[PDB]
């Protein structure tokens, strides 16, 4: 198939990676600070959702330097993955548009 | 069948350290934590520490004096925490708990009975 | 740290009535409050995850309710199986604490 629905397909099985990935290293570096409450799997898991997309209803964060290092990258592996999908949606517009008119 | 396996008890001169020693059985996960508890006569449980085997680290009670170490030996499935340096004050049970990372200890050993006397 | 507060230390109740043990957390902590039992000389048994929660194996006289700061364990017809300490525990911020435990006596 076409470059980028593939690199689109990819980005969004190595989002659900990052994601799943995330959650646990966020649990292992915030158990160990007073206060913090990303330390059980199942809401962690929700924290990377959210945190993929930035929906930021404010329910969870990180404390502690490396839980916001894994934050780090999950918040830029989502935000990349979501803008390389409209990307390729642009593409797929751009060249059916060249097709609706002639070229 | 008994999920985690502990001894039964262990004595301990003043000043010794002791390793207990907590063997894990029935489902195994890259993600459970196993947890030690303390609980003195007539006393309540206290949280001592915690320790993601898959890894190797360990999490403590820092309002305490820290008389504990935790390890873990991945091969033979066994959790160790190492008390050093004990008076009467460390004498109690000293239960292992497994916890599948979701908060709550869904089972728990029989506990050791630590008695620190000359 | 959250503290968890059980009062009353000591609970007095009449064969088959219904009872309610108090776990009160010195600040919010949604429903991530678990109940466990601890028989003379026996080890603790998870009764209740989550504040109302079910585990199997676990009789259904049991029941949790609260969230937030206030907790109850109840049981339905207690009977004398139920002497026992009944103890909270949370999980919402680290470190996991546990109350100063609730011991259930019955009058007969």
């Known amino acids: 198939s076409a470059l980028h629905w593939r690199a689109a397909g990819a980005a969004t099985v190595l989002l659900v990676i990052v994601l799943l990935a995330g959650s646990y290293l966020a649990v292992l570096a915030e158990r160990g600070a007073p206060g913090a409450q990303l330390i059980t799997y199942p809401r962690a898991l929700w924290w990377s959702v959210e945190t993929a997309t930035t929906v930021g209803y404010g329910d969870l964060y990180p404390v502690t330097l490396w839980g916001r290092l894994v934050a780090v990258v999950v918040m830029v592996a989502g935000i990349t993955s979501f803008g390389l999908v409209t990307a390729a949606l642009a593409t797929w517009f751009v060249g059916r548009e060249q097709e609706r008119a002639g070229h | 069948q008994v999920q985690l396996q502990q001894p039964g008890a262990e004595l301990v001169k003043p000043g010794a350290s002791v390793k207990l020693s907590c063997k894990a059985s029935?489902?195994?996960?890259?993600?459970?934590?196993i947890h030690w508890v303390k609980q003195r006569p007539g006393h309540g449980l206290e949280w001592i520490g915690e320790i993601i085997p898959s890894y190797g680290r360990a999490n403590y009670n820092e309002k305490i004096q820290k008389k504990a170490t935790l390890t873990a030996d991945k091969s033979s499935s066994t959790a160790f925490m190492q008390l050093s340096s004990l008076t009467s004050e460390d004498s109690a049970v000293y239960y292992c708990?497994?916890?599948?990372?979701?908060?709550?200890?869904?089972?728990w050993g029989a506990g050791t009975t630590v008695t620190v006397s000359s | 740290d959250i503290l968890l507060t059980q009062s009353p230390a000591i609970l007095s109740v009449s064969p088959g009535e219904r009872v309610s043990f108090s776990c009160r957390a010195s600040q919010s902590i949604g429903t991530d409050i678990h109940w466990y039992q601890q028989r003379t000389n026996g080890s603790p048994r998870l009764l209740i995850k989550?504040?109302?929660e079910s585990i199997s194996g676990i009789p259904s006289r049991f029941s949790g309710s609260g969230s937030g700061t206030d907790f109850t364990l109840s049981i339905n017809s207690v009977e004398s199986e139920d002497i026992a300490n009944y103890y909270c525990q949370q999980s919402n911020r680290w470190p996991f604490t546990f109350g100063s435990g609730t011991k259930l006596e019955i009058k007969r």
């Open positions: 029935g489902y195994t996960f890259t993600s459970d934590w």
């Open positions: 708990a497994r916890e599948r990372g979701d908060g709550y200890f869904a089972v």
């Open positions: 989550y504040a109302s």
